[PDB]
């Protein structure tokens, strides 16, 4: 019944719609864009001379094309016959692929929705089902993509995840507040995700093996899915689908990539609530699959070994779960799910493990707070005052930044002059930074001072080498400055720059948060944490941190970690993990003996 329908449809191409007639046809993606514009325009949508009587033409076109795509994808042959090699099925696949290009499907998936927003009254303004782009439209597109084209390449899988799926997941995770949970938008998006997207990513689990390059994207996927798993409006089937998808992806994932998700898990599992059941199984599976990663000194040769920070996290998780289970009243399936996790973590932990005497400081657990799951606050540096020696460095970086801005204006075509006109593209500010005035210099200087006061608040030691002093001892216009594209920092400096990038994003998070609450609506999509942010979103702040650290290095100043350990107590056997574990076990056994004596 599918072959006959496909043959009749290709015999009469009029059934494919004006966009897909094949002559003068803009295409499926262009048809969707035109439908968006039609739905936005009031005159073209309604009759314009009874809500049921009214038909939105844009939504009707959207539904027609979605139905055609769904029908064709369902007519696509089953994979078993294709593997068997039936020439008729191969021909049907070829015809369908010729009819619908892949790029159009990717574009239509990449089209974004319109979230409901809160109002000043506290009421919710809601876009309508009857008019607009709905997730049911993308459902058919995904069905076509995974029924005729198929995702069998890791590069295609990660590109699709980056372009179409991740934004929708982030939107669903951001629509998880108390008021917006019951909105029709959120229910439709949840159904779409849990019925089409997540099962597809579950079936494409093995492709996630060799993804060391897209570590940020995989980490963002893991955080977004886990955050969505905490929603309230989610039904039993949707929750089970999310659990299956997470368990499937994490198993094929490499051990090193799970660190950021474990950071959140060690904070929520101790609660031992109903939601903790899935994290319990996830932790059990991870620590059973990657036991050689921790216990063995070398671990997997290709994978590597722990960084002692994962070991500290695992120790904290183990002890937190142990204490929480000791305090908690007996609950049969909670205990039955938690015991294997405790055993797996205990087995993974090296018995000879040395706990960090230099305990990890300045963790941003407040950023990953319990309520709202994101509290953005930077490390305030107003009390910290700048040193006098770095004034020369500040001046040099300010003039370098002014020069680069002059690069950019010359490239865009702005011309020097004496009159300031934005329309005329004439700019008196093309003069050299030395000829700039103070609060012509101040606009450059202020971010510079703030950034390294932020450095100072963290206690990092900034120093100038004797050769750095040799630099200063040695001591309109055509601007030409240092090209720092080739300069590279060490890994330690890369992590240092990453953490200031996180702080500098947190600053913008605060400013945008008070903008959010001042306007009273329109939640910004990029309000997600730094870990949840992807590479393209992170790029600007990362390169800012990179170039400031690079200029420090080039000018010869030295930046390091200002904290020093007073004494590394390696010989002490008492703080070995086995010591505390056995001592606590002995205390528990003695307590039980006294209880049974009574």
């Amino acid at each position: 019944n599918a072959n006959v329908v496909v043959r009749l449809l290709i015999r009469r191409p009029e059934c494919f719609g004006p966009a897909l007639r094949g002559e003068g046809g803009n295409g499926l993606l262009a048809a969707m864009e035109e439908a968006i514009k039609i739905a936005e325009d009031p005159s073209r949508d309604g009759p314009s001379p009874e809500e049921d009587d009214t038909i939105h033409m844009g939504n009707a076109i959207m539904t027609f094309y979605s139905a055609l795509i769904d029908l064709l994808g369902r007519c696509a042959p089953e994979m078993h016959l294709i593997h068997a090699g039936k020439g008729e099925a191969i021909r049907i696949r070829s015809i369908l692929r010729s009819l619908i290009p892949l790029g159009d499907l990717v574009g239509v998936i990449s089209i974004a929705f319109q979230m409901p927003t809160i109002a000043k009254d506290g009421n919710v303004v809601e876009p309508d089902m009857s008019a607009g782009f709905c997730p049911d439209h993308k459902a058919a597109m995904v069905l076509f993509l995974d029924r005729v084209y198929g995702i069998e390449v890791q590069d295609f899988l990660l590109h699709l995840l980056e372009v179409g799926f991740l934004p929708d997941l982030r939107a669903a995770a951001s629509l998880d507040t108390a008021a917006l949970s019951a909105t029709d938008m959120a229910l439709a998006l949840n159904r779409y995700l849990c019925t089409a997207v997540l099962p597809l990513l579950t079936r494409c689990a093995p492709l996630f093996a060799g993804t060391e390059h897209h570590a940020s994207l995989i980490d963002s996927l893991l955080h977004t899915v886990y955050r969505l798993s905490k929603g309230c409006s989610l039904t039993k089937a949707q929750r089970d689908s999310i659990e299956v998808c997470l368990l499937s992806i994490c198993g094929q994932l490499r051990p090193s990539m799970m660190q950021h998700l474990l950071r959140r898990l060690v904070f929520d599992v101790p609660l031992l609530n109903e939601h903790a059941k899935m994290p319990l199984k996830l932790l059990t599976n991870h620590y059973e699959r990657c036991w050689k990663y921790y216990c063995l000194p070398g671990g997997w040769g290709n994978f590597g070994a722990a960084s002692e920070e994962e070991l500290h996290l695992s120790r904290k998780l183990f002890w937190g779960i142990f204490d929480a289970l000791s305090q908690k009243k007996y609950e049969q399936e909670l205990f039955k799910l938690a015991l294997p996790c405790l055993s797996a973590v205990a087995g993974a932990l090296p018995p000879d493990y040395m706990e960090s005497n230099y305990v990890s400081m300045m963790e941003k657990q407040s950023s990953m707070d319990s309520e709202g799951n994101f509290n953005p606050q930077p490390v305030d540096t107003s009390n910290i005052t700048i040193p006098e020696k770095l004034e020369y460095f500040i001046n040099k970086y300010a003039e370098h930044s002014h020069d680069k801005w002059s690069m950019d204006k010359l490239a865009n075509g702005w011309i020097y002059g004496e009159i300031y006109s934005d329309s005329s593209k004439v700019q008196p500010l093309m003069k050299p930074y030395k000829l700039l005035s103070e609060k012509e210099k101040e606009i450059y200087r202020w971010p510079i001072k703030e950034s390294l006061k932020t450095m100072l608040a963290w206690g990092w030691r900034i120093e100038r080498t004797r050769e750095g002093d040799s630099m200063a001892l040695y001591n309109g216009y055509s601007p030409r400055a240092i090209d720092m594209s080739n300069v590279t920092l060490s890994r330690d400096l890369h992590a240092m720059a990453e953490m200031m990038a996180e702080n500098y994003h947190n600053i913008w998070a605060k400013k945008k948060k008070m903008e959010l609450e001042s306007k009273g609506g329109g939640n910004h999509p990029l309000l997600v944490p730094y870990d949840t942010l992807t590479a393209k979103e992170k790029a600007k702040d990362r390169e800012k941190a990179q170039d400031i650290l690079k200029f420090l290095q080039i000018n010869g100043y030295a930046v390091s970690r200002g904290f020093k350990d007073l004494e590394l107590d390696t010989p002490s056997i008492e703080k070995r993990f086995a010591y505390s574990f056995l001592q606590q076990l002995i205390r528990y056994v003695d307590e039980a003996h006294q209880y049974i004596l009574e």
């Binding site: 240092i482 090209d483 720092m484 594209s485 080739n486 300069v487 590279t488």
Partner: protein, 34 residues
């Protein structure tokens, strides 16, 4: 103008090495070996 006769009679040769901006010069040595 460089003298053509001087270049024809000379036996002095030259090459140059450009360390790209970003490669620390303290980790780069230049010269001749046997």
């Amino acid at each position: 103008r460089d003298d053509y006769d001087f270049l024809m009679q000379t036996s002095t040769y030259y090459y140059s090495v450009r360390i790209f901006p970003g490669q620390e010069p303290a980790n780069v040595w230049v010269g001749w070996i046997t």
